[PDB]
Amino acid sequence: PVLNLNDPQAVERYEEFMRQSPYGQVTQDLGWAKVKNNWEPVDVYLEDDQGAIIAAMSMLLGDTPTDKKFAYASKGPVMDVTDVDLLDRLVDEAVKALDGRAYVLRFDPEVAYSDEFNTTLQDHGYVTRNRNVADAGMHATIQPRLNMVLDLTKFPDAKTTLDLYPSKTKSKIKRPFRDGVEVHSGNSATELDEFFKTYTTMAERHGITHRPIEYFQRMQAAFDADTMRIFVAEREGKLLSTGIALKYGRKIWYMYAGSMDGNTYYAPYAVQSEMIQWALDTNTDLYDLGGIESESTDDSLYVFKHVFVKDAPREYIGEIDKVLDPEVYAELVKDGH
Amino acid sequence: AXCXX
């Protein structure tokens, strides 16, 4: 069925499924639609025999330079996507709800790439975007497909961040604290302002684009202090670096960060250590430092994240596209050919 | 446009 966003009991039943699923993702929560307020939300689900939700897909529809919308279910759907017959059923529900308004329904679930799962999806009529568009770099897909994820379940007895690391890394983590960096956290306007100062400074320094403060205020308003937390690193009252982490499903995800110019006294490492500490204190399975471009010492995103993640990066299946208007799909999407 | 998110 399609979710009636005006019926709070239905909405609460859908949220409860999302929040409790092992496949839950913050970008599939209905609060993500509040963040992405320039997109239109359409959400669908399937039920088992007893009427319980068993699978759910939160879509956001975006404008394009054609008469069709782009429908996108970021890191969804919420179910086991390798159960391709069940995926088809949920997708058919999504397609009915879209009602011919979109040219594509794209979803990019955090499930590993394999040849067998790629070929299955393609057998089932989806167009996939992964290794065939890899030469175009990290932005070949909307979300990075290579991600640095720390599996905390390999350290069932770890009590503190340093328990996860070899002595050479323990040294790197201890350094900012020894040098007087202190980290506070919370989810108020005060921490948001400290984050935004460091975020806009970093964006200017790197020459990259950046989102307006209202994006993060809508995120703060949507997510409570047990789900969203901003960590702020200072030394003797001087602001140095910050990061925002979201706890949802099986992971705490380091999503946004900023740092001031010049010497930051390794404050970004102190922010990582505290986010990791949050994941341990809440018995969370995974800590996700998110994307990189390549598993290479030429990639500065990988050099930083490999301090914390010694395993290989996860490589996901990438974008799975249910093509609905093939003429518009061919105009707007390139297959890496 | 640029890390997603």
Curated annotation (Swiss-Prot), chain A:
Changing residue 318 to S: Reduces activity 8-fold. Its EC number is 2.3.2.10. Changing residue 143 to T: Slightly reduces activity. One of its GO terms (biological process) is cell wall organization. It comes from Weissella viridescens (Lactobacillus viridescens). The keyword Cell wall biogenesis/degradation applies. Changing residue 318 to V: Reduces activity 20-fold. The record marks 108, 319 as: Important for catalytic activity. This is UDP-N-acetylmuramoylpentapeptide-lysine N(6)-alanyltransferase. Coiled coil: none annotated. Keywords: Acyltransferase, Cell shape, Cell wall biogenesis/degradation, Peptidoglycan synthesis, Transferase. Pfam families: FemAB. One of its GO terms (molecular function) is UDP-N-acetylmuramoylpentapeptide-lysine N6-alanyltransferase activity. It catalyses: UDP-N-acetyl-alpha-D-muramoyl-L-alanyl-gamma-D-glutamyl-L-lysyl-D-alanyl-D-alanine + L-alanyl-tRNA(Ala) = UDP-N-acetyl-alpha-D-muramoyl-L-alanyl-gamma-D-glutamyl-N(6)-(L-alanyl)-L-lysyl-D-alanyl-D-alanine + tRNA(Ala) + H(+).
